[PDB]
Write a protein that binds this ligand. Sequence first.
Ligand SMILES: Nc1nc(Cl)c2nc[nH]c2n1
Ligand SMILES: Nc1nc(Cl)c2nc[nH]c2n1
Lengths: 215, 204
Amino acid sequence: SMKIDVVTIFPEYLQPVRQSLPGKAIDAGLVDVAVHDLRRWTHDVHKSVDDSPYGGGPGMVMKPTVWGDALDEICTSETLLVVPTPAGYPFTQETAWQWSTEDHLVIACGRYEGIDQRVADDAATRMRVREVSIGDYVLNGGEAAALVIIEAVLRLVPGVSLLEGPSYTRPPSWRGMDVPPVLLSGDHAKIAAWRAEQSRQRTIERRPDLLGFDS
Amino acid sequence: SMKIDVVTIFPEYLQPVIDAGLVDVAVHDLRRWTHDVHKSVDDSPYGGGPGMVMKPTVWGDALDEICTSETLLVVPTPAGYPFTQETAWQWSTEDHLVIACGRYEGIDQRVADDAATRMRVREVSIGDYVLNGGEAAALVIIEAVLRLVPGVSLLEGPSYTRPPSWRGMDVPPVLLSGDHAKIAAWRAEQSRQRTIERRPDLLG
Ligand SMILES: Nc1nc(Cl)c2nc[nH]c2n1
Ligand SMILES: Nc1nc(Cl)c2nc[nH]c2n1
């Protein structure tokens, strides 16, 4: 069974991990997900986790000291440390398959302008570290990305290309819109071929990159 | 002022949303619009194959109640157009977003096609991986859009803060130099190197 530890300053926000696909995985005993408040490893009265960036710039950077202490306690040499960041390597379906075989994922959720780079650099001297992005958009922090990664990985664990075209179910006519007749015909070869043509049309239109075309 | 309605069979997933003003996020249990005592939301796919397809009659009723002509209907799906920061900026000025969360096998296509005859519909993916359902994607979309609502190229390089020395690693001395033109040039080179290494697709 897999162990996933999530470290965040917003532990309550990782509640969606519950009943859902990850929730079912947890209750089936296929994974254990534990969420940790980063502030647990602070020592000052104000529980500060961030400070202004060296060299200037807007916002705050998360302090290495607190993160270092947290990861010391939670990680081992076998840990795969996942660091969600807009500046990361792309997280893809291939990545999800790869991580689905891991014994222990630790996900370090950052906020503000991110985590002092020395945290990942230091961790990499003792364990495998993967800084990853889940897409080309900006988030306030890594927490929502952690949920996406957990969803993409867990649905692949034992025990749990091109675009899929349109799908239909009953009734065969609805608001004057009919299900494509071929889908009702029971002709496997014809259905297979129609579904391939639909997938091609959709992939060209929506994701031409998947077929090696521009945009 | 933006209103976001999310429709899902997992309302608790999305439930915990700041609470600062002109932004209302309401979550709706899709089972509210089911017709049968079993509260069925999906059915076997026409043409065969694995999985289930979400029912058009249920989704049709839900969207009829929740949507208006002004609504931007967002449908998270792995088969979508890509959701990008450009998309986020566009949607941030919308008065009403409705996010229809379904299982990845899909909502019967007639739902989106019907809706598109009376409102703007956007089927979108948030990346190149499959999720079992659109719920986590909706969280990402809501976050990416709302942080662009006032008061609601190249990769960035490494950042640093106190202490100047930690576990044998010093903050790059240039950042402490007070030469701010040089600091900008150093950061640009860091960005170049990181983009080449991690995201060469961004350079062409
Ligand atoms: N904070 C954060 N984390 C991850 Cl993985 C991201 N992927 C895209 N934007 C992102 N922002
Ligand atoms: N179910 C689902 N939905 C959306 Cl928007 C996705 N975007 C990428 N993978 C996805 N999977």
